[PDB]
Amino acid sequence: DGTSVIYVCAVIILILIWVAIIGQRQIWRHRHNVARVRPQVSLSSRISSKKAVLLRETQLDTVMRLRCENQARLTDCISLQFHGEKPYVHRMIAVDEVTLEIDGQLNRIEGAVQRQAGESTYSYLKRIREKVPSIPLNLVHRIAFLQESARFRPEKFDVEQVMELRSLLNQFLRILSAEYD
Amino acid sequence: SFWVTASVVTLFLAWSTFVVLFFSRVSALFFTFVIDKYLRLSKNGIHFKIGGISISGLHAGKIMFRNVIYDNGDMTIKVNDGHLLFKYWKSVEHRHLNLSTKRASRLHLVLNGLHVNIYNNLTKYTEIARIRRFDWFFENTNMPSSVWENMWNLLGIVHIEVSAGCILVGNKFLPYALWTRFENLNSKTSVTESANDRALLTFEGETENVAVSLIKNEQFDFTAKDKDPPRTMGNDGCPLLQSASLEFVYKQDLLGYVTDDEPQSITLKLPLWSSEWRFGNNTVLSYGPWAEQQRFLIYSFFYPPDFQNSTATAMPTRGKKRIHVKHDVKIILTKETCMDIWFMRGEQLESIRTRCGPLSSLDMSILWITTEKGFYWNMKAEFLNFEATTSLIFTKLFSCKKFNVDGSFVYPLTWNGEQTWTIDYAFTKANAWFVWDHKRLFTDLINDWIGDDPSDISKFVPFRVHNRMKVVDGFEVIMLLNESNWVDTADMNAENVEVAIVGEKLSFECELPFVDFLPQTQMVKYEMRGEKSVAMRAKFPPDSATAPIRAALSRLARCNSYAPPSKHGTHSLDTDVWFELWRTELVKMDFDHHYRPLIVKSNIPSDIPFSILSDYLPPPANHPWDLEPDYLGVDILIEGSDVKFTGLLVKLLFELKNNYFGWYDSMTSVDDEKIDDPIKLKASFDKTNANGMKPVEYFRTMNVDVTVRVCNVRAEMLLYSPAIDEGAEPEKVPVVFVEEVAVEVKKTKTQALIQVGVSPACAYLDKSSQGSGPGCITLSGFQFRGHAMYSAKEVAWNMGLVEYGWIMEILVGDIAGTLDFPAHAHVLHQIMESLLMFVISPDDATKVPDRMQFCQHGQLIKACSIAGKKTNEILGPCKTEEQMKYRQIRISVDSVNLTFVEEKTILQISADPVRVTICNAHESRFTEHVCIRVPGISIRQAVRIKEKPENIWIEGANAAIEGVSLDIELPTPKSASPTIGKERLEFVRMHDADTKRLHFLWADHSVWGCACFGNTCFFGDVDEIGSTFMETLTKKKFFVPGIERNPEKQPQVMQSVILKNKPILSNQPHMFYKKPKLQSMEMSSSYATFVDNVRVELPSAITVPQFGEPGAILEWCQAHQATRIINDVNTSGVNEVRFLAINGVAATSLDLFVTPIGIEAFERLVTAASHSVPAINPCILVHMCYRDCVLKKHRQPLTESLFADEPISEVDITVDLPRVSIGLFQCGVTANMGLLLIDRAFIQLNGSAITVQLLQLTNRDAPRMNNLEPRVMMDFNVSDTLIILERPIYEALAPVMVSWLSVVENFLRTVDKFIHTVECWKSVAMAKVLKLALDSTDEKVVVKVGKNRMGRTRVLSAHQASCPSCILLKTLFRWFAYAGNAPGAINHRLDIRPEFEIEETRKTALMALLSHWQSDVGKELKLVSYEDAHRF
Ligand SMILES: CCCCCCCC/C=C/CCCCCCCC(=O)OC[C@H](COP(=O)(O)OCCN)OC(=O)CCCCCCC/C=C/CCCCCCCC
Ligand SMILES: CCCCCCCC/C=C\CCCCCCCC(=O)OC[C@H](COP(=O)(O)OCCN)OC(=O)CCCCCCC/C=C/CCCCCCCC
Ligand SMILES: CCCCCCCC/C=C\CCCCCCCC(=O)OC[C@H](COP(=O)(O)OCCN)OC(=O)CCCCCCC/C=C\CCCCCCCC
Ligand SMILES: CCCCCCCCCCCCCCCC
């Protein structure tokens, strides 16, 4: 009877196929131990869809842009109730003075805007001076140095430096408003 | 046909395999499509996908699944496979959920291969964008009680099982990701009854493995700024908290609603929210500064600062849902746990590896709300059996039986507000090892931890740290005080000289007020107290040639201590090896540190071009001396003390200064210092001193004002106390009582002012067995002043300082003493012997490490670059500052009145102000000079005649030497170049032009000056005291305390240089330890009628001084003054009738009066000397023999190989001899006196008139008291004398000769008897000790102890290893120290046999004992070379 031979051949080949597939799957499962194999930080290593990976990469880029743009405003109404008398209040005033006097004033249609990445007072003032060459090169350098000395440098920063920075900012704004009526 | 059945079977195979192994994929596709559509996941930006699921097992509650992925924009949750069982066959116990009863686990979840990857925190960043109106960011991202109760009743216990799981924290913008992994997580989530809340959710479970680490992000663009981790475990990255098991219990109240009228309380009915973590075996728990930087980066990303001033949270009111108040964390270490701190110093991996015992817990309460004070979080760590070790060559750091930390950290509302850290440290029975390398290591660790990021005002947050360290139940600090800071790194039997400070309570407080942004100066104050039963113990290597001597001295000294021994310490309780020499009840040390913070100005993020940036910035300093120095105020007080004084105290103080505040701050193992090429020697030295890698402000100097005050010091002058006589009280160790010792050091940039002030000091000497009485010595005061002059010319910045002038001034007050003879003379002799032996320590002296042999230029003795410039070489040998500096010592002793009292004789030695000066650049000569100025010293003697109820004393003899003014010019030191004088002159005038403090170099005088005179700057521009120092004509005491109120004029004697217009000594009450509970009457009368009678007034009653109130030591000194010998005018007698290069006057005059009774009294003294000889300890004899060996440098005939050195010329003397006036007298029943007068002589060699006259007290009857007795002369004269050697009457004269010659013969016989007595005693006692040591089986008494690994580093190591007569003596020291029969020599013992009187037998006994000892000695005897000539 050939039917019995066909049946037994089918049974043995089916069992062999099943055991081979399940053994390969079991080997794969055993090898992929998540407590032994070091993972990858890449999002594409866990998410197969390219659209979701791209969306999350864009969200991470937006978060990094926010981190760059997230700058503390030291000169604040309730932050001056604190400090106020402490010796470092003057540099706190100075670091925000440049921002308030320039960005808060030059936030118009034709005014320049500080870049979100690589935010530099020196580079921003250079960009402004490129459009408006009336401002001397000494003015921008001195203003940038005053703000940088307030922010980072151990040299004595006091009311005199704050007054100098305010006078230079007033001169800069006066010339820039003369050039921008 | 076969084709049809083949097609059918192929279809069977395909369909069956697909439906049994691949239908899950299509079912998962369908369910993935359905789920995100029905709940709108894709619309809400959620990526969801299922790679496999089963539908046929629903009627068994089983739902298999595979490749389940869930991403919501913040974290990715991925599961490789698993199954979800709902065991519906388990009956529901109740209609409604009863939280108070047990429920079956109807829900069972198994997850295989769980991934959780947290890469973003969109909520906080969206909140920040909303609060800052960043509209651009907000658009680019493109973004029920009944049911709860029924579901929790239906599910019962949620059994969640995770075979393997990993948690990854990080994204593409973080350099490193936090990888947390575990295995075999079995957990049971349950809901139970909760007080004040809806329900309590508990998440218990265990994990059979857990590990956390920081792994490298592959997407990151690492630059040179990024720093690699100190250590990695292969691909796992930097480890953190490895463990073998973890048991976790997470509890969280499910919040309800407020029912009371008042809002939710902050302290009452708090919702429960806790977390418990119990760790098993193999917990390693590493960390470090690099891990801290990575933690800061990851946390700052995932928890960004909004820079918003917070507000006190509004507590929910009635009817509103409650909120969580705080979270409690409890971490328990159930086994022994390691806790390591790893950091990098250059290219070497350093570590602080600690350990804690089982059941060491960490508690952590974190407030989850904000109040009007902001928010805070607590911490309570407890480490049992906490043991710490370092990575240095000396790895021992710390150990205690319990360590408790209580930290409270408060954050105010404003993000910029001042934080407050309050940390309390508590130790129980803690012992520590302190080396200066530990301070260097911890400073490097702290600097690495802080980092190199620049300070930003927009990121600056002020904060104070309140540190309070407490040690209870005993503390112990061990300091390694090996000479030249050698260390033995052997784990066992470390042969290190160690000093341990022990006590009951130790305190340490330190506030860190970092409340200013880049302040010009930062001030930090430290306090440290040892508060009860404080002691100082000293240990020496067992075979160091100091330990046996010290142990013998301690065993044999008969000292009574007022301070009970301290039971504290852990490694210093072995009294046989540890010597407890100091005992006090309080030691407080205060530190006041003012410093300019070291800002790395190269890290300032300046976008301005450097060309114009330098214009605005101030010019940088070219030299470290151009900077304003830092400040450090040190204030140490020792409240009281009971001291076992010895020279080892001085030695240990010197080693402390060298190893902790001197050039030798760095340890050196005794196994590494093997370098012979100076080129590579300099290279290794250069690498450690990386001057080019540091800014100029790193080498900023520091002004230090040290004030050390030691109060109420009772010191035991340890010696070999004599033998005990049965009928007499044992003679104890002499005791010195000092009320206060004040030490002030004022070190500035260019000079240091060392000033030591001592109050009046007593010395009570115990009454001897002879019976004369107790002795006393009184010192009115002592002051030391040292002016060190500094310069930085041609000095390496690592040293940054060379000393070219060193002026010292010793001022000794009035010395008054009343000592008995010969006991107290012997006491002084052996006190000086032990003191000098221990201070010098010739066999204990060690070679300086080659890398530590600094020069005048800050480089090494060998391979010095500046000397290389001379003779045009790369490197040459410079010379040390000791050989080149100008040193000058001024010594002044206001007075000296010592009386030696015998039964029938006293001998008073009185002196005038004595000045001694040592000047190595005296006048124009730059060689060692000694100047002696003794205006007068007299010796008087009184002989007691007791034929009356009142004592009768006569001036038997007199002496007087006046006008001694000698200038000694010692030759140049041997092995010194011929041009040392020129080199020293150039060195001195090079490092002086900037200051001109040594005025004698710039004076325009033909004859230069010295600090011998006032031609130097000494504590001021004008040296007032030094101007008239050598002017002894006025005879004016120099120790007169006073206050000088001119800041430019130098301060007077006993006037603090730290304070202003204040004496260095303050009379303040302090703690002290109380006491625990001739032979013929006719001849003597005949001499009394002629010789001047005197009254002797001894001190009234020498008692034991007690400190009591301030000034009581002064009162004891004032009561026991010097003995007075008062002359009587009515009994005045015949004592007065009379008629290399060395320069100066030997003496102005030399008086001498002698009578036969005076020589009789000298005989009395000599006889008393010999009587006390058998009562002397043989140990002092062993000590003196050993002193001979060591002072000879062990120059045996066997050790002559080591001595191959290979004044000798130009010795000239020009001195003036005194006018000698000798007056003799002799009376016998009648009075004959002979007067000798030698006029002044001079040596170039001449003489002068000599008059010898023999008078005769013959009355005015035969051709004011004795008005009838003139003097009739028999004269004899010599006109002059020049020696040039350059390289009846009988009847009256007979009684004179037969008396003077008889007395002289008796004196000479007595002297010979004393000499032979001493020799016989020496031989007999040495033989006795040798025999007793030979017949001893005690383990400690042995020829050689240990391996003597430290002996290789000692000078004269080869010599002492081949003084076999000195190794044997060291064994004898060990016999005195440890043998049980050693107290067999504390008996007053004469010769055991009458045979020992004969010389030959007593010498042969000693020779035979030496022969017996030779075989035992020779086993370890290391012979230098070989002497076969002596062997035969
Ligand atoms: C290193 C090995 C890892 C071991 C992990 C140790 C413990 C870590 C775990 C903590 C598990 C978190 C418990 C579940 C969250 C608490 C439930 C919750 O609060 O949901 C909100 C809501 C209301 O609660 P409130 O407290 O009032 O809300 C305040 C703010 N939410 O809760 C509910 O209404 C439903 C209550 C049940 C929901 C909880 C889910 C039940 C099962 C949880 C098991 C978690 C499995 C994860 C373990 C896998 C291994 C990592
Ligand atoms: C009070 C109870 C008994 C105490 C028991 C321990 C005895 C320890 C004894 C003597 C040493 C104590 C002095 C400790 C600080 C030394 C002061 C000092 O030199 O600081 C200088 C240093 C820089 O010097 P250098 O690096 O060498 O370079 C300068 C030019 N070459 O400047 C500073 O940092 C200021 C130092 C701050 C003072 C605070 C130190 C507090 C003392 C700590 C001692 C540690 C022992 C405590 C362990 C006990 C545990 C059971
Ligand atoms: C019961 C135990 C305590 C009893 C023991 C009493 C000891 C006997 C008495 C007094 C000790 C002698 C006082 C020594 C004072 C130290 C003076 C000193 O060395 O200052 C110099 C030095 C300045 O030179 P540099 O810093 O290297 O150069 C900087 C250039 N930019 O000053 C310093 O460095 C810091 C000063 C710290 C000194 C504090 C330690 C004082 C020493 C001992 C006091 C306590 C003794 C207990 C330990 C005894 C162990 C032998
Ligand atoms: C170096 C001479 C030491 C002995 C001189 C000082 C001791 C004075 C007292 C005399 C009695 C001691 C007898 C000899 C003891 C070694």
mmCIF file of all heavy atoms in Angstrom, chain B residues 1394-1411:
data_model
loop_
_atom_site.group_PDB
_atom_site.id
_atom_site.type_symbol
_atom_site.label_atom_id
_atom_site.label_comp_id
_atom_site.label_asym_id
_atom_site.label_seq_id
_atom_site.Cartn_x
_atom_site.Cartn_y
_atom_site.Cartn_z
ATOM 1 N N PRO B 1394 84.609 37.065 96.549
ATOM 2 C CA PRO B 1394 85.787 37.883 96.874
ATOM 3 C C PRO B 1394 86.901 37.741 95.854
ATOM 4 O O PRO B 1394 87.879 38.496 95.918
ATOM 5 C CB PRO B 1394 86.216 37.352 98.245
ATOM 6 C CG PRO B 1394 85.725 35.944 98.262
ATOM 7 C CD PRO B 1394 84.434 35.946 97.491
ATOM 8 N N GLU B 1395 86.779 36.795 94.920
ATOM 9 C CA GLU B 1395 87.813 36.584 93.916
ATOM 10 C C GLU B 1395 87.830 37.696 92.877
ATOM 11 O O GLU B 1395 88.881 37.974 92.288
ATOM 12 C CB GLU B 1395 87.600 35.232 93.235
ATOM 13 C CG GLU B 1395 87.244 34.110 94.194
ATOM 14 C CD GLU B 1395 86.622 32.920 93.494
ATOM 15 O OE1 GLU B 1395 86.561 32.930 92.246
ATOM 16 O OE2 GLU B 1395 86.191 31.976 94.187
ATOM 17 N N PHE B 1396 86.689 38.348 92.646
ATOM 18 C CA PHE B 1396 86.588 39.357 91.599
ATOM 19 C C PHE B 1396 87.448 40.584 91.863
ATOM 20 O O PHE B 1396 87.640 41.386 90.944
ATOM 21 C CB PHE B 1396 85.131 39.783 91.418
ATOM 22 C CG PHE B 1396 84.340 38.868 90.530
ATOM 23 C CD1 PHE B 1396 82.961 38.820 90.614
ATOM 24 C CD2 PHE B 1396 84.977 38.063 89.603
ATOM 25 C CE1 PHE B 1396 82.233 37.982 89.794
ATOM 26 C CE2 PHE B 1396 84.254 37.223 88.781
ATOM 27 C CZ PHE B 1396 82.881 37.183 88.877
ATOM 28 N N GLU B 1397 87.961 40.756 93.083
ATOM 29 C CA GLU B 1397 88.852 41.879 93.354
ATOM 30 C C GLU B 1397 90.119 41.787 92.513
ATOM 31 O O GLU B 1397 90.621 42.803 92.018
ATOM 32 C CB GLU B 1397 89.195 41.929 94.842
ATOM 33 C CG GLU B 1397 90.228 42.981 95.210
ATOM 34 C CD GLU B 1397 89.737 44.394 94.963
ATOM 35 O OE1 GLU B 1397 88.509 44.622 95.032
ATOM 36 O OE2 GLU B 1397 90.577 45.279 94.699
ATOM 37 N N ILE B 1398 90.646 40.575 92.340
ATOM 38 C CA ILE B 1398 91.835 40.374 91.524
ATOM 39 C C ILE B 1398 91.507 40.662 90.064
ATOM 40 O O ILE B 1398 90.459 40.253 89.549
ATOM 41 C CB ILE B 1398 92.373 38.944 91.715
ATOM 42 C CG1 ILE B 1398 92.824 38.730 93.162
ATOM 43 C CG2 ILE B 1398 93.528 38.678 90.780
ATOM 44 C CD1 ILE B 1398 91.776 38.092 94.049
ATOM 45 N N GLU B 1399 92.404 41.387 89.392
ATOM 46 C CA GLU B 1399 92.104 41.894 88.056
ATOM 47 C C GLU B 1399 92.053 40.782 87.015
ATOM 48 O O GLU B 1399 91.162 40.768 86.156
ATOM 49 C CB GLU B 1399 93.138 42.946 87.657
ATOM 50 C CG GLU B 1399 93.000 43.446 86.230
ATOM 51 C CD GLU B 1399 93.999 44.534 85.896
ATOM 52 O OE1 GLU B 1399 94.504 45.186 86.832
ATOM 53 O OE2 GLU B 1399 94.279 44.737 84.697
ATOM 54 N N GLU B 1400 93.007 39.850 87.058
ATOM 55 C CA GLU B 1400 93.104 38.862 85.989
ATOM 56 C C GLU B 1400 91.869 37.974 85.931
ATOM 57 O O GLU B 1400 91.364 37.680 84.843
ATOM 58 C CB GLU B 1400 94.372 38.022 86.149
ATOM 59 C CG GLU B 1400 94.731 37.673 87.578
ATOM 60 C CD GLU B 1400 95.720 38.652 88.183
ATOM 61 O OE1 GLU B 1400 95.695 39.840 87.798
ATOM 62 O OE2 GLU B 1400 96.523 38.235 89.043
ATOM 63 N N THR B 1401 91.359 37.543 87.085
ATOM 64 C CA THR B 1401 90.201 36.653 87.075
ATOM 65 C C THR B 1401 88.942 37.372 86.602
ATOM 66 O O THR B 1401 88.155 36.809 85.830
ATOM 67 C CB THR B 1401 89.988 36.036 88.456
ATOM 68 O OG1 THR B 1401 91.140 35.267 88.819
ATOM 69 C CG2 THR B 1401 88.765 35.150 88.464
ATOM 70 N N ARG B 1402 88.731 38.616 87.045
ATOM 71 C CA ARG B 1402 87.547 39.348 86.605
ATOM 72 C C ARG B 1402 87.628 39.716 85.129
ATOM 73 O O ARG B 1402 86.591 39.865 84.474
ATOM 74 C CB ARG B 1402 87.336 40.602 87.457
ATOM 75 C CG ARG B 1402 88.456 41.613 87.363
ATOM 76 C CD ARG B 1402 88.190 42.843 88.206
ATOM 77 N NE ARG B 1402 89.314 43.772 88.173
ATOM 78 C CZ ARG B 1402 89.501 44.690 87.235
ATOM 79 N NH1 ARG B 1402 88.670 44.816 86.214
ATOM 80 N NH2 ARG B 1402 90.554 45.498 87.320
ATOM 81 N N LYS B 1403 88.837 39.875 84.586
ATOM 82 C CA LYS B 1403 88.953 40.104 83.150
ATOM 83 C C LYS B 1403 88.750 38.816 82.359
ATOM 84 O O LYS B 1403 88.112 38.827 81.298
ATOM 85 C CB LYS B 1403 90.307 40.729 82.822
ATOM 86 C CG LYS B 1403 90.400 42.197 83.188
ATOM 87 C CD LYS B 1403 91.600 42.862 82.546
ATOM 88 C CE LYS B 1403 91.589 44.361 82.801
ATOM 89 N NZ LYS B 1403 92.689 45.058 82.083
ATOM 90 N N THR B 1404 89.275 37.695 82.862
ATOM 91 C CA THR B 1404 89.132 36.434 82.146
ATOM 92 C C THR B 1404 87.696 35.935 82.168
ATOM 93 O O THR B 1404 87.257 35.286 81.215
ATOM 94 C CB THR B 1404 90.065 35.375 82.731
ATOM 95 O OG1 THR B 1404 89.925 35.346 84.155
ATOM 96 C CG2 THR B 1404 91.510 35.679 82.369
ATOM 97 N N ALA B 1405 86.950 36.219 83.239
ATOM 98 C CA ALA B 1405 85.535 35.861 83.250
ATOM 99 C C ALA B 1405 84.788 36.578 82.135
ATOM 100 O O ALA B 1405 83.989 35.967 81.410
ATOM 101 C CB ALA B 1405 84.920 36.193 84.608
ATOM 102 N N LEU B 1406 85.056 37.872 81.970
ATOM 103 C CA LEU B 1406 84.417 38.636 80.907
ATOM 104 C C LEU B 1406 84.851 38.138 79.535
ATOM 105 O O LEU B 1406 84.035 38.062 78.611
ATOM 106 C CB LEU B 1406 84.736 40.119 81.076
ATOM 107 C CG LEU B 1406 83.867 41.088 80.282
ATOM 108 C CD1 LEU B 1406 82.410 40.796 80.548
ATOM 109 C CD2 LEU B 1406 84.202 42.517 80.653
ATOM 110 N N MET B 1407 86.131 37.790 79.382
ATOM 111 C CA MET B 1407 86.597 37.262 78.102
ATOM 112 C C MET B 1407 85.929 35.930 77.772
ATOM 113 O O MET B 1407 85.549 35.684 76.620
ATOM 114 C CB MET B 1407 88.119 37.114 78.118
ATOM 115 C CG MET B 1407 88.864 38.436 78.170
ATOM 116 S SD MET B 1407 90.605 38.268 77.743
ATOM 117 C CE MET B 1407 91.129 37.055 78.948
ATOM 118 N N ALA B 1408 85.775 35.058 78.769
ATOM 119 C CA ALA B 1408 85.103 33.783 78.543
ATOM 120 C C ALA B 1408 83.638 33.987 78.179
ATOM 121 O O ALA B 1408 83.102 33.286 77.311
ATOM 122 C CB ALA B 1408 85.230 32.897 79.781
ATOM 123 N N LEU B 1409 82.968 34.935 78.838
ATOM 124 C CA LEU B 1409 81.581 35.224 78.482
ATOM 125 C C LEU B 1409 81.478 35.786 77.069
ATOM 126 O O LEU B 1409 80.542 35.460 76.330
ATOM 127 C CB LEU B 1409 80.967 36.178 79.503
ATOM 128 C CG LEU B 1409 80.813 35.537 80.881
ATOM 129 C CD1 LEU B 1409 80.351 36.546 81.901
ATOM 130 C CD2 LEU B 1409 79.840 34.375 80.807
ATOM 131 N N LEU B 1410 82.433 36.629 76.674
ATOM 132 C CA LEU B 1410 82.471 37.106 75.296
ATOM 133 C C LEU B 1410 82.637 35.948 74.322
ATOM 134 O O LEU B 1410 81.998 35.915 73.264
ATOM 135 C CB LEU B 1410 83.605 38.117 75.119
ATOM 136 C CG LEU B 1410 83.267 39.608 75.062
ATOM 137 C CD1 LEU B 1410 82.754 40.108 76.391
ATOM 138 C CD2 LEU B 1410 84.485 40.406 74.626
ATOM 139 N N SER B 1411 83.499 34.988 74.665
ATOM 140 C CA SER B 1411 83.683 33.820 73.808
ATOM 141 C C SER B 1411 82.395 33.016 73.690
ATOM 142 O O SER B 1411 82.046 32.543 72.602
ATOM 143 C CB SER B 1411 84.811 32.944 74.351
ATOM 144 O OG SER B 1411 86.027 33.667 74.414
#
